[PDB]
Symmetry: C3
Subunit: 205 residues, 3 copies
Amino acid sequence: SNIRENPVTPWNPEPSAPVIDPTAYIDPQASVIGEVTIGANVMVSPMASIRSDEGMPIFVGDRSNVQDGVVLHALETINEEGEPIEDNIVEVDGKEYAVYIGNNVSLAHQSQVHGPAAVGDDTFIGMQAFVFKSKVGNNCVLEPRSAAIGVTIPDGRYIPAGMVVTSQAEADKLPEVTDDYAYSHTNEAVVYVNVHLAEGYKETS
Amino acid sequence: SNIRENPVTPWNPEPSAPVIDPTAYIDPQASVIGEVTIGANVMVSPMASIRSDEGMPIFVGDRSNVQDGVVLHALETINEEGEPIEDNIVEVDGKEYAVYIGNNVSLAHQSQVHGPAAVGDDTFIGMQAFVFKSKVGNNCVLEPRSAAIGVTIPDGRYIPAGMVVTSQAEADKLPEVTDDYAYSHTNEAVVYVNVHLAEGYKETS
Amino acid sequence: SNIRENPVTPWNPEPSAPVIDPTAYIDPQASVIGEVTIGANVMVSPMASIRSDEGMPIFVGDRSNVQDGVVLHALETINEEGEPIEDNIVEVDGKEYAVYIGNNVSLAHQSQVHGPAAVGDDTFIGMQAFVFKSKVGNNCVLEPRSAAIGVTIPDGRYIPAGMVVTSQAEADKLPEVTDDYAYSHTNEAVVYVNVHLAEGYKETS
Ligand SMILES: [Zn+2]
Ligand SMILES: [Zn+2]
Ligand SMILES: [Zn+2]
């Protein structure tokens, strides 16, 4: 099966299986392993790998999409001695996650979000982009081939294509999404399409 | 099955199945979905995802290759009201495509060509490279990790490794492929190898 | 089967099947083809593609890991006339390889090592990184999105995130890994985790 439990390890005494909303579509050629929660109307495309086998949950919110070849994974959140590694855990609305993906988020083809990381609602993570040890705000756009490592990206900012942002001083001065910006409406269109694709693919299974 | 029809959606009243030349080899661990035409002697490697589920055809020409982890997908070409979105359609030799890949084209490992896009004959798209909203000419080389977004790349030019080209002014001044250039003969070698691999893998199926 | 022989071609008269240590774990959604040797306690994750179909062996040493979406492949090492192409072969400890990955090496998610290439022991190849026509020394760190093309990386150096190194003059002046460097202990942690994951996943098969 392509939806599987995680294994017993010294930081994982009890295997967990994914919790998947009945309205989500998981492609047969995707892989979803371990302590993962997937929300309503989510589309998970071929060759995506969502792997939660190092402690703590990976959460994917409602009406989000995980496109072809995307990888979600996380650094260890609990060491062998049972002690939580707080640097590798993100907090969102009072709860702890290894990776938190909000609602109406698009993770476009071949992107990767590696824990610890959080991605806020209505954000487009572009093709081949990379997020690691970062919190990306709501209503952001990461253009194709951009990256955020070790930073907080404020709400409503974008990262231009190819830019690798590794310092908070850079992140603070990123440009703002405006109506005339080329990707200002991209995420809403992609979410609309993917919610409809999920329903159509479900009707073929 | 890994060769599948696309689903019924508001922009796709009628499902389409891929049209695949009998001399092409599609690896069992590749995914090919929807309105796709694959030409003669094409090799599609493990973990490639060719997904035509947003309207209009993805075409892969004769003697081309689609290597491991490559993704082909496209933006919507027909909106819900049946109206064609002309910005997201490319025209090649009088016909309309979401993605057009010409003859003798190599799409090397982990690259991505996202529609609207066209790639001309005898072009090497290097490892991890990215093409989106662009027309790449014939006899071009995109070196590994290069990208073309929103531009036309003239025939016989190359993009150096790691360069992300987003303006036409940049694209117009790209260097020319010459006989002494390091990748000048790369595509011909890769095409020769892949046509022979396709035949060898077909003999094991 | 996802563990397969390579095909008969003009440079490969005799098919070879992978040689895999009984303590290694190969995920069912990985692909391993051809003349490949995998060492003890190696973890190969979903969507990895290890493909040795152009002559010469791809070797993955003991306690190494090949994470999700990683690709290993190599340029042709033997031409049609049976003549070895020496430029495309690396030598390590008196033996010839297309790709050599040493012991305790982490190939992180979506990275790629393309032959000819060698990666020395205790090296971290970061997420989305790229190695081609290069020898990477022991105890190195390639940060996420870095690349080494056509160069030798001395022992104990790192490449900062996003940097594409294509000249030996650049490679010679790369910074050194020190105890206070952010990724100085990353590889040891990742190797420890992956050796334990391999054993846990083996207990579920
Ligand atoms: Zn990871
Ligand atoms: Zn797409
Ligand atoms: Zn290759």
